[PDB]
Symmetry: C3
């Protein structure tokens, strides 16, 4: 049968990639046509060779790729990078997650920024974009999930077709919650609740609501993972991020609204201090809380701390 | 019937867009997939819901879009922007124009730079491009009109199919003259004639030759309308214009010809003075004459004057 | 018949292009859709109007174009430029080459960088790319030839279909050797052997192994021909080359490897001295040896010397 042939086969990568893909700070490289294979490899190792039908999975991946836009940061490369960070978390916390969760989270990460224009929720609201009229909160994130469902509804694209309806509904809910959690506006309240539950010892992974929160923080950790790469990667990625932000700032100016210094290209000299404030307020607390809950995710925090030190070095002019 | 269903329907935009689209200094935004709807909205309001068959119009618009190139300035965004300026002129001078003229001028504006490579007529002549051998004068503009006719000749693309042959020939002549008028080389003689006719009182909109001249000036006013936007928009658009000019200057250097300082990237520091000279010699007289002939177009002149003041501020280093 | 209609026809270019295409320092221009016609013109003049079936040749050219990537330097424009340099060599040494060689070399030049990603053989080895596992030496070049054969194998794409199998095998070997020779790592040993054979007088174009070496040097000369253009062209092309090199340097840094100063964007100030060293060590000896073997190729050396003088002028700050 088809599933019998797939069970005998094993998908493989080049030697360097096979070894280094297990590291949290792995970079997927500049060869775009290798990314689909990298994702399939990660799915096969974290879930199994029988989790998805290979022909359907490949069809799904290519359609997801087609629905990411040619923008500096929120692009196809970001999607696969976020998926890799989730893979590394999953592999280092392997006993904790169900088959459905491992299936759902990797797919959620791949789809989490689908059809991103490179503009924030704030900008879409101020422009009065039709999406803002449809989705009052988490505007882009609700759209990302809508795009995901639409791709799944295409003929030959339902990668969850072998699942029961019950399991199908469960995995789609996992995906929905995970994608919505990537709205950074929701992260601050989530992390604060998680910190309190951890300190009191009330935090329980057997409680679904608690489990959803931890998954939410995992999604934030994967989404921001550029700060957990080695310095050369982190610094170069920052160029892509600001390219998008400054473009939005330009568009804000076109609306007759003065943008925040973060999005203002006239204030390039304040970037090192701006990054310092981001690491202190957002990045460090995120990976600190995640390391407390899931100790094997420690390398993410260490790398984040190392990059914080690098930004301090830039400020001093060293 | 089909026209009966279209009569009952009404096309609408978001609240902010509906209000601000009436302003001369309106910016169409960075969301490309909203531009077709913006154009249809303008056609529906200025001409009527029964002017074009909606399915044919949408098919036409998408083909026009496909025939604009990925260049910094002379692109799809420019086409819709020029069309909007015409819409604002039409709406503020509503009693003056026939149904054919309102139909023709919006379409002429949308099509006026079709298949633009980002090079001037001068460059094509010096390169010895096949287009220069076919069209001795107004090389690109004659090509733009040829592209327009070719798109109209495609199956299901004749948006003027319900018109009589007489009316069809009239609208195509309106379109031809309007597009040819966007050759800035022809503007100087046109404006000079219009100024004389206005001052003597011989200018008569009931005279076809006079009417053609006024339409010609309207086309120039719409074409140069980036100088009538608010300062942030005007300044950012200037970056796109010079990107094209400097690229042409590079190509001129490749032919062994020293380009004019306007097209020379080595003379970036002279841009503010170069803009000052352009406003004084071309932009201000254009909108002054247009305001004299059509007083409701006054906001274009005011905004042009405001931008002239801004460039003077740049020169002083303020 | 079809070949009879083709014999009566003659393909022509604009006046300036017809005259200046014969010069070694000719630039093909910024009009992409003119390049296919330029190539066909060169084939018709150097080989003949009966060398290729026009419909098949055009189909081949467009497929080759489709298989070049949107990279700053190793792109479709480079391919046609390299082909032109070969045309100029062929036309100025017309009595030396067979019909098969003239056919093969122009096609080899057009196909010599097929599917180039903008990365060196060194980078692919260090990244551990699948291509490096398949091709241990001349990694990209062996791939370029593989792409060439694949395009030829497509239905209606065999431009050599009228040739006997014997002649077909001969032309494919000419193409293979020519493309492999564009590996600059192989140039140094080739030029050294050619210099020795020329000085002793053992060099004999009637000897196939010697002939292969001369063709190899011709390929190097055509590949590096940007240094033989006029200064404005040479200087602007250098921007495209470094764009690719610095991108590779960035990727090297992402692997945790410090790139050589050539590929390091942090060392932009050393470019003029870096170019000086390249002209002295690689470019000048290449065209000197080629001029010794084929004296009509002298204009390439003169132009290379002129550009060397220009780089020296940059260093002095003049
Ligand atoms: C919007 C998305 O969810 C993500 C949001 C966070 N993100 C970033 N990741 C790593 C580094 N930087 C990221 O975005 C920024 C987050 C914060 C800043 N902060 C500031 N930057 C500046 C720069 C100049 C002047 C003031 C400021 S304040 C700048 C960029 C990636 C995109
Ligand atoms: C060719 C098209 O019909 C249009 C021509 C006019 N156009 C412009 N609109 C707004 C602002 N600038 C436009 O183009 C220019 C028109 C004039 C100049 N003038 C000069 N600019 C410089 C810059 C440096 C040194 C000397 C000079 S002279 C520069 C640009 C948009 C394109
Ligand atoms: C890889 C391909 O076969 C070709 C290799 C040679 N090539 C060039 N042609 C003309 C000019 N430059 C070319 O590539 C270079 C060849 C040598 C250098 N040399 C150096 N450049 C620098 C710059 C800064 C610091 C040190 C150095 S050393 C730079 C670029 C075109 C591409
Ligand atoms: Zn997002
Ligand atoms: Zn994201
Ligand atoms: Zn134009
Ligand atoms: Zn225009
Ligand atoms: Zn090559
Ligand atoms: Zn090459």
């Amino acid at each position: 049968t088809s599933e019998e042939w797939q069970g005998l086969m094993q998908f493989t990568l080049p030697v360097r990639l096979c070894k280094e893909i297990e590291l949290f700070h792995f970079d997927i490289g500049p060869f775009e046509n290798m990314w689909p294979g990298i994702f399939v490899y990660m799915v096969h190792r974290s879930c199994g060779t029988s989790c998805f039908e290979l022909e359907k999975l490949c069809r799904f991946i290519m359609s997801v790729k087609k629905n990411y836009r040619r923008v500096p940061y929120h692009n196809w490369k970001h999607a696969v990078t976020v998926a890799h960070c989730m893979y590394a978390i999953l592999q280092n916390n392997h006993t904790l997650f169900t088959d459905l969760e491992r299936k759902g989270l990797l797919i959620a990460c791949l789809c989490h920024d689908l059809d991103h224009r490179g503009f924030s929720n704030s900008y879409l609201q101020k422009f009065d974009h039709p999406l803002a009229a449809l989705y009052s909160t988490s505007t882009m994130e609700q759209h990302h999930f809508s795009q995901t469902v639409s791709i799944l509804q295409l003929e030959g694209h339902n990668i969850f077709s072998t699942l029961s309806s019950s399991e199908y509904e469960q995995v789609l809910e996992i995906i929905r919650k995970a994608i919505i959690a990537t709205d950074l506006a929701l992260y601050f309240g989530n992390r604060k609740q998680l910190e309190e539950m951890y300190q009191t010892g009330s935090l329980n992974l057997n409680n679904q609501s608690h489990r959803d929160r931890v998954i939410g923080l995992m999604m934030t950790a994967c989404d921001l993972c550029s700060v957990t790469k080695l310095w050369p990667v982190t610094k170069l990625t920052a160029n892509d991020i600001y390219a998008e932000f400054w473009a939005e700032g330009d568009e804000m100016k076109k609306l007759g609204i003065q943008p925040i210094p973060m999005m203002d290209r006239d204030k390039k000299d304040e970037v090192p201090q701006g990054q310092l404030g981001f690491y202190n307020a957002v990045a460090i607390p995120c990976y600190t809380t995640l390391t407390q809950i899931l100790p094997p995710t420690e390398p993410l925090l260490k790398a984040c701390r190392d990059n914080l030190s690098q930004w301090e070095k830039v400020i001093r002019g060293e």
